[PDB]
């Protein structure tokens, strides 16, 4: 697909940041190496459900004033194409497949089959969690349902699973045409307190490490590489300075389009014609 690393990072960082900040022992583990007073002051101010201060995330160049006490500024950077395929063919498909998804589901009995229901039509099934079927189990997929023989499996009549699958758009042939790009985004934790900037740096590094395992950047946005700048005053001529430490996140990812092929051939036919010269 076409991709937007900045909007991915914003969407991914915001919930993760919230869920760490609402959970005191995570911060208590992340900041174990800092000075005791720095740790306790940060945990008192920003952390837990009762926290009176708050962190914020957003893109650069807003028209309004931000929470300069603690704010992650996201800042889309450079990139370049790095590797190309022969014919620019990144892949080919017989059935137009959408995004990868993971969904929780439960088995139910139906007509002496077990079935799992999924919210969308299954374009491909990658994994039913914790199950490997035998041929006897007569595994079949149909529409948005996975179906599974009941006879030997009655103990599992309400078994709970996670389905990893991917959507289908439509039944069509085509070529995925495109290339790989290596692209940079900068993130900086702004604070007018230097110890807050240093803690926001630690929290962001933890978040990015945790992010490396996510399906989003396992399937796309691969090879996350991190670089770190000096701590410096970002703005120097207010009533106080604003400090930050930049980090650069670099990703390798595919830019591509679905070139559908309308041509289809369903019968050869043969004829002999005679040359009398």
């Amino acid at each position: 697909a076409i991709t937007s690393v900045d909007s991915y990072l914003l969407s991914e960082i915001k919930p993760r940041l919230n869920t760490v900040l609402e959970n005191c022992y995570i911060i208590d583990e992340v900041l174990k190496d800092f000075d005791y007073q720095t740790r306790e002051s940060f945990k008192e101010a920003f952390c837990g459900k009762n926290a009176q201060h708050e962190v914020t995330v957003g893109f650069n160049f807003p028209k309004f004033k931000n929470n300069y006490e603690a704010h992650y500024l996201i800042q889309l950077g450079q990139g370049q194409e790095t590797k190309n395929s022969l014919g620019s063919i990144q892949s080919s498909y017989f059935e137009a497949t959408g995004d990868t998804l993971v969904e929780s589901s439960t088995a139910i009995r139906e007509d002496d089959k077990l079935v799992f229901t999924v919210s969308k039509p299954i374009g491909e099934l990658i994994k039913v969690e914790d199950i490997e079927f035998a041929k006897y189990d007569n595994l079949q997929v149909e529409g948005n349902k996975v179906s599974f023989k009941y006879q030997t499996n009655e103990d599992y009549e309400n078994y709970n699973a996670n389905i990893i699958f991917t959507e289908k758009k439509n039944d069509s042939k085509g070529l995925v045409k495109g290339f790989t790009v290596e692209e940079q985004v900068t993130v900086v934790g702004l604070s007018f307190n230097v110890d807050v900037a240093r803690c926001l740096d630690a929290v962001l590094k933890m978040i990015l490490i945790s992010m490396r395992d996510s399906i989003e950047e396992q399937q796309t946005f691969q090879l996350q590489n991190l670089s770190f700048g000096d701590i410096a005053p970002i703005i120097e001529d207010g009533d106080s300075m604003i400090f930050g430490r930049p980090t650069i996140i670099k990703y390798t990812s595919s830019l591509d389009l679905d070139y559908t092929i309308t041509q289809d051939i369903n019968k050869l036919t043969f004829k002999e014609r005679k040359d009398w010269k």
Partner: peptide
């Protein structure tokens, strides 16, 4: 590299780097 497809059994080979 962009002008030439590689095909096996009537399918193009995706992400081929050299031949």
């Amino acid at each position: 590299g962009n002008t030439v497809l590689l095909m096996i059994k009537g399918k193009p080979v995706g992400r081929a780097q050299s031949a």
